[PDB]
């Protein structure tokens, strides 16, 4: 169960795991929905859907093998699951239908059907869903005029102005050989190490990825969509996280576990926890938490999110969460750090060791492109056992003391005071 | 040199209040003496200070 890298034209990384028996070859691209300017937003989505429709229709009738994909910010994650002993067919299909040719798939009728399906899907996502809506709005507001804030799906206005030529140009400017790993997560050992190097298994347009000019930034802003028709509320605070490949990633993740998740409709969640959960339960202040610390190569975000049925006590929820964040950098009980360490160990163990090979393939590709070499979870355990209260205190004092916050919540938000009793209260306590 | 050192100097609210009070004290003293000096030398021969010296013989 050891990961092996190399560099022979295309980086090939394998993580044998004899436990599961669903071999899943894959392809991962390091430039997704961030390295592209806002005027052509949904090109990655169009690629994703043309794949997932026509190639999914073809594969099963040809052989037996599913297929999936993903995109977060810079991840043309692109996976072809299979049986343990049919990976050569998977690579043959992947060669013959994804990198070449790109003309038989991009037919007019097929492209237009994909276009209308994507339009319908983005439309009803904008209508029905809500937490993901406010999350995308949070990203957009935190990175204004930065190639990081445009959504993964896109905007209908941007979608409507795409036919072929721009999709072809993106294909020729980001499907290179410089940044295209070939993941082999599953129960394959070395066939992936050799078959990936053949006569022509090499991406078209060898060259480099065109680097964007501006890097990133941060500045606080609101994109609220205040509308009283919807029943509940939604908020999403944020403070600038830690970028991947920094010696603060894991301590930030720990700071994103002391408070932890919550769900006020469970007998096993309303009762445990920390001081804020004791202080909230007296009334029905809130209805959900979600603490997270997202990180990307450009920069990272330390998240927060609720969905509160109560609409009049929003300010009290906000004030209590802010006081907890304020005092996280003044005094933390050592037992709190210990419990956070144990819980976070559990969370990473669950995430990295899911029985589904696709998620492991995704994460292996992510790390191998960004870090350059996978960091085994064992080293994660050893390097997290040494996180002491001094380190968390220092990191919190650096990242959470009078800092810009981005908030963008839909629903009924009129009870939320606008910006000064939501920011200048974030250090008011006499430290 | 407005680096993180001043932000760390302003991080603690209590030292902020201590510094503002000490500044108030020193400001009160120096401002008062400066204002008195300017008001005084602005009037040569007017104020009693030099009048009593002149009448002294």
């Amino acid at each position: 169960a050891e990961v092996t890298q190399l560099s022979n034209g295309i980086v090939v990384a394998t993580e044998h795991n004899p436990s599961a028996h669903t071999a899943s070859v894959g392809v991962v691209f390091g430039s997704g929905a961030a390295n592209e300017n806002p005027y052509n937003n949904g090109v990655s989505n169009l690629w994703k859907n043309i794949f997932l429709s026509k190639e999914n229709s073809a594969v099963a009738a040809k052989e037996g093998l599913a297929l999936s994909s993903n995109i977060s910010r810079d991840f043309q994650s692109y996976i072809v699951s299979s049986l343990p002993g049919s990976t050569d067919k998977s690579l043959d299909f992947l060669n013959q239908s994804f990198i070449q040719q790109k003309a038989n798939l991009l037919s007019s009728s097929n492209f237009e059907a994909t276009k209308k399906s994507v339009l319908k899907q983005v439309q009803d996502f904008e209508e029905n869903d809500h937490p993901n809506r406010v999350l995308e709005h949070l990203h957009s507001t935190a990175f204004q005029n930065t190639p990081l804030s445009l959504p993964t799906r896109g905007t209908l206005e941007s979608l409507e102005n795409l036919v072929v030529a721009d999709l072809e140009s993106f294909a020729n400017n980001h499907f290179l050989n410089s940044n295209a790993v070939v993941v082999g997560t599953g129960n394959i050992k070395h066939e992936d190490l050799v078959n990936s190097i053949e006569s022509k298994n090499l991406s078209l347009q060898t060259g480099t990825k065109p680097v964007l000019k501006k890097k990133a930034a941060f500045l606080g802003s609101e994109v609220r969509l205040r509308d009283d028709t919807l029943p509940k509320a939604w908020i999403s605070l944020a403070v600038e996280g830690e970028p991947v490949n920094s010696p603060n990633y894991f301590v930030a993740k720990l700071a994103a576990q002391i408070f932890g998740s919550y769900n006020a409709f469970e007998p096993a969640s309303r009762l445990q926890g920390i001081k804020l959960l004791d202080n909230i339960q007296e009334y029905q202040l809130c209805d959900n938490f979600n603490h997270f610390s997202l990180s990307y190569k450009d920069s990272g975000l330390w998240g927060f999110s609720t969905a509160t049925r109560n609409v009049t006590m929003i300010d009290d929820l906000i004030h209590f969460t802010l006081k907890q964040w304020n005092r996280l950098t003044i005094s933390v009980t050592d037992t709190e750090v210990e419990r956070a360490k144990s819980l976070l160990k559990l969370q990473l163990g669950q995430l990295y060791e899911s029985g589904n090979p696709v998620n492991d393939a995704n994460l292996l590709g992510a790390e191998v492109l960004i870090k350059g070499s996978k960091l085994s979870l064992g080293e994660a355990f050893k390097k997290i056992d040494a996180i002491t209260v001094k380190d968390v205190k220092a990191w919190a004092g650096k990242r959470l003391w009078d800092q810009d916050i981005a908030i963008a919540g839909t629903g009924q938000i009129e009870g939320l005071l606008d910006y000064m009793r939501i920011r200048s209260d974030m250090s008011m306590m006499r430290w | 040199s407005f680096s993180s050192l001043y932000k760390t100097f302003f991080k603690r609210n209590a030292v902020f209040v201590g510094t503002i009070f000490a500044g108030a004290f020193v400001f009160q003293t120096v401002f008062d003496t400066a204002i008195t000096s300017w008001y005084e030398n602005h009037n040569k021969g007017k104020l009693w200070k030099d009048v009593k010296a002149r009448i002294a013989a």
């Binding site: 995308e136 957009s140 507001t141 905007t155 206005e157 994109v223 | -």
Partner: peptide, 24 residues
């Protein structure tokens, strides 16, 4: 103009610096 398309704030943004010095 979609919802995500923020208006041009560069007429007032402090694009230069944008560090802790402003807070100070």
């Amino acid at each position: 103009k979609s919802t995500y398309r923020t208006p041009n704030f560069d007429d007032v943004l402090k694009e230069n610096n944008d560090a802790d010095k402003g807070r100070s």
